[PDB]
Design a protein around this nucleic acid. Structure first.
Ligand SMILES: [K+]
Ligand SMILES: [Mg+2]
Ligand SMILES: [Mg+2]
Ligand SMILES: [Zn+2]
Ligand SMILES: [Zn+2]
Ligand SMILES: [Zn+2]
Lengths: 234, 48, 125, 51, 48, 44, 96, 51, 48
RNA sequence: UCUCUCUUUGCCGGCUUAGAUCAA
RNA sequence: GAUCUUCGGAUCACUUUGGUCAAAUUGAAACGAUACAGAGAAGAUUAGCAUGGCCCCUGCACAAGGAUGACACUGCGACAUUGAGAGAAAAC
């Protein structure tokens, strides 16, 4: 009898006793673009009142919370759920098609069959974590000296490098690696070039950090990747 | 002409429907020639 | 003031409805991608455009961006002053997006669109 | 649970946008009597000339 | 009505328009053509 | 909304006693009445 | 962009005269030349919603399903067609 | 609901060192009153004991 | 002003006068009905 | 049983005072 | 705090916060101008009324207007093939 909106108890307050109001037809569904009733309550004294933002047809076809839109089974954003878990196909993003899908899905879904069962949801969660753990575990000579000497003069089967003392992996990994070798200024990097250049407040920290040497390095777009292919022949 | 009251403009404009009623109630109680001023009981929207 | 005057940290997860900056997130994602992103997609990278003084654009933006939050990927076009810095958390990402607009490096900070690289799409997924 | 009262002066809250009509229920079987034969002669007798 | 049309839209679809002494002929012609279409659809036998 | 949609004729009229309600039509004998009326017309 | 342009032109052409089955047949053919499934079926069954008694459309749909070796799909389509029009022998003959 | 809200606040602030009675209500109010500054006297109106 | 008709000036005596020469498009867009004009004139009388 | 050609081959915008007038 | 009551106490009152959303570049619309063509019915000038809908605008309007408001008004294969000949091929 237009009784309740579905809200999880994380954003329903830690009090088992709360009061809320409804304003019928108070907003257009942010997905259905449909006239829907609003519900306002207080999570806890001292913060701004919450309110429901999506209709009852949604957050049910999505099995989600009308206010926080965290999925009611796992508790992480429904967008990330449908992007990574990929349980069942979602709707479009354009206006007319999205509202058409919302209307027809609400119709065929109130006919009685449920579009969301949690058994397959947990199965897909375990499948995703399994795939994650699975993820966890003369032509070369001519493209070698073709341009290295050119740049070296301009601004400076097997190949073995030299070690000099002249005075997938994000950048924060570099940040928490060099912090014990001296203060950091900026870490400029590029995955394609695979070259990460750091700067310190003093050259003494740089030289003491570089002395730790015996995967590591010591001192256009495609134009910077010529020496990155040396990784294939390192 | 201020955004401080930008939330009330829709209600402010919807009272345009009942404005002629306000005109009738105002003209019905116009002071007569023999009285210098007349105090009228009034009912107003909290929006103004 | 009634709001935090500090920098968001690693464990500062907010509601999906409320923008991590305190605002609210709609669904249509607009056409200029101007003020606040949509909740139907989560992009950790932002388009920053502006000056292209010399080859040191990468380092200057790095200097001007590390202080705003944890950085994941910096990709700055050499031909034009266009960069696509990718952040680690939504809070730092949107804080820097809102906090660096019309600054000196005015900067045209906007929300990035879908990356057409099938490899970048694969790694992002 | 309390129904919040609406402002009497409040105009219509939002626009209404038309939606193309949804698909109907799927058509029933036809159940016709078996078709009769007409033959080419009667096919010709119902042929109309151009105007 | 003015404020409803202002804040809602035309709602042009799904409205009827009475015959008003200028559409009389153009509506009579439409009705006659529809009737003739029905008669054609009927008197022509099956599969012709 | 529209001028012609305003309330009007809010009282539905029912057939009264001598106006030919269902009770009388069931009680009446329509057949011989019809033949008598036809004969009266024929006489003219 | 080319499929978008052709799609928009065909979509208006079928919205203007929704009873023109030739437009739906041509739209299904042109859509079938690259993206062989899913929305092809959508467009075709939309046309059947417009008029399910058009036997040429049913036959065209069957043939278009069989070109791409979808057999069980076509058998389901025949069951629908034969339970819809049991007194036309063309569908029965093609089925058998 | 009043009691549950009070209990939640007490649990959050860990400050539950009070009792309940009839005279105890006035006794609790006494110290909150003495912390308060006095209410001025009307017709004293611009500083120096304004109401 | 919720019609974009910002070039029309409603003076304090309730006269609708354009502030600039209007093209055909503006003139057709800025045409009000009998309700608005009737209410404006009643308001003018009340102000008198 | 192929290839080409010919032939056979049933076949798949409306209304009104014609809307009204008309010399280099 | 007022009232009684007998210095035990009793009365009297009892949980706000209308939120197109935090001090206006980057989440209330819709465009100016310049540059191109640039005014329905088979010659030419031209009355109009209609049909269709994810096209609207003015209007209080189920009047009427906006160029007859604008756009649109076409076209194909549930064709069965045999009727025959010729060189080849495999076949009367
Ligand atoms: K004309
Ligand atoms: Mg008209
Ligand atoms: Mg028209
Ligand atoms: Zn929730
Ligand atoms: Zn919805
Ligand atoms: Zn502050």
């Amino acid at each position: 009898d237009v009784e309740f909106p579905s809200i999880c108890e994380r954003c329903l307050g830690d009090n088992s006793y709360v009061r809320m109001t409804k304003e019928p037809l108070g907003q257009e569904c942010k997905i259905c673009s449909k006239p829907c009733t609003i519900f306002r309550w207080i999570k806890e004294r001292g913060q701004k009142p919450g309110k429901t933002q999506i209709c009852v047809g949604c957050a049910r076809y999505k099995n989600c919370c009308q206010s926080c839109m965290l999925d009611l089974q796992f508790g992480l954003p429904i967008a990330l759920r449908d992007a990574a878990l990929k349980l069942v196909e979602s709707g479009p993003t354009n206006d007319i098609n999205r509202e058409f899908f919302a209307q027809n899905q609400q119709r065929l879904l109130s006919n009685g069959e449920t579009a969301y069962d949690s058994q397959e949801a947990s199965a897909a969660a375990r499948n995703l974590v399994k795939k994650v753990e699975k993820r966890e575990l003369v032509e070369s000579k001519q493209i070698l000296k073709e341009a290295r000497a050119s740049d070296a003069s301009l601004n400076a089967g097997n190949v073995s490098l030299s070690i000099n003392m002249e005075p997938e992996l994000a950048d924060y990994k570099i940040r928490k690696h060099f912090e014990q070798y001296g203060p950091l200024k900026s870490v400029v990097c590029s995955h394609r070039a695979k070259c990460a250049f750091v700067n310190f407040k003093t050259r003494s920290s740089a030289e003491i950090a570089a002395a730790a040497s015996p995967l590591k390095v010591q001192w256009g777009p495609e134009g910077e990747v010529r020496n990155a292919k040396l990784a294939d022949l390192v | 002409s201020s955004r401080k009251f930008r939330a009330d403009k829709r209600s402010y404009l919807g009272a345009l429907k009942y404005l002629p009623h306000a005109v009738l109630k105002l003209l019905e109680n116009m002071p007569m020639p023999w009285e210098e001023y007349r105090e009228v009981k009034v009912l107003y929207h909290v929006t103004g | 003031c009634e709001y935090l005057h500090r920098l968001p940290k690693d464990t500062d997860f907010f509601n999906a409805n409320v923008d991590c900056f305190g605002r609210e997130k709609h669904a249509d994602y607009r056409d200029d991608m101007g003020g606040v992103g949509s909740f139907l997609r989560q992009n950790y990278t932002l388009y920053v455009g502006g000056i292209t003084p010399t080859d040191d654009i990468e380092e200057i933006v790095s200097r001007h961006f590390a202080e705003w939050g944890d950085i994941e990927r910096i990709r700055v076009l050499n031909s034009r002053g266009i960069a696509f810095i990718t952040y680690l958390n939504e809070a730092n990402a949107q804080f820097a997006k809102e906090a660096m607009a019309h600054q000196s490096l005015c900067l045209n900070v906007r929300w990035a669109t879908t990356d057409p690289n099938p490899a970048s799409q694969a790694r992002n997924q | 649970m309390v129904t919040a009262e609406q402002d009497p002066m409040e105009p219509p809250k939002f626009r209404h946008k038309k939606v193309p009509r949804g698909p109907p229920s799927p058509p029933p079987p036809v159940l016709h009597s078996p078709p009769r034969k007409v033959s080419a002669q009667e096919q010709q007798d119902w042929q109309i000339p151009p105007s | 009505n003015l404020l409803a049309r202002q804040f809602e839209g035309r709602h042009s679809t799904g409205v009827a328009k009475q015959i008003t002494k200028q559409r009389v002929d153009s509506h009579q012609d439409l009705e006659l053509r529809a009737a003739v279409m029905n008669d054609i659809l009927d008197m022509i036998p099956e599969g012709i | 909304t529209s001028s012609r949609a305003l309330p009007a004729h809010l009282k539905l009229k029912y057939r009264q006693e001598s106006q030919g309600t269902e009770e009388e039509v069931r009680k009446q004998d329509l057949r011989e009445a019809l033949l008598r009326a036809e004969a009266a017309h024929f006489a003219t | 962009e080319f499929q978008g342009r052709k799609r928009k032109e065909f979509e208006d052409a079928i919205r203007r005269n929704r009873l023109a089955m030739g437009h739906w047949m041509r739209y299904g053919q042109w859509e079938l030349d690259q993206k062989e499934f899913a929305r092809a079926r959508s467009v075709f069954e939309r046309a059947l919603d417009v008029d399910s008694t058009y036997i040429p459309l049913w036959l065209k749909y069957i043939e278009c399903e069989m070109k791409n070796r979808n057999i069980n799909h076509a058998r389901n389509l025949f069951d629908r067609a034969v339970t819809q029009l049991p007194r036309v022998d063309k569908l029965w003959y093609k089925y058998v | 609901y009043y009691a549950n809200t009070h209990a939640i606040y007490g649990k959050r602030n860990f400050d539950d060192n009070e009792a309940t009675t009839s005279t105890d209500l006035k006794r609790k109010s006494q110290k909150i009153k003495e912390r308060r500054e006095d209410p001025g006297d009307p017709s004293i109106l611009e500083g120096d004991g304004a109401y | 002003h919720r019609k974009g008709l910002t070039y029309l000036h409603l003076d304090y005596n309730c006269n609708l006068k354009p502030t600039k020469t209007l093209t055909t498009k503006e003139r057709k867009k800025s045409r009000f009905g009998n309700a608005f004009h009737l209410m404006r004139e009643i308001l003018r009388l009340t102000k008198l």
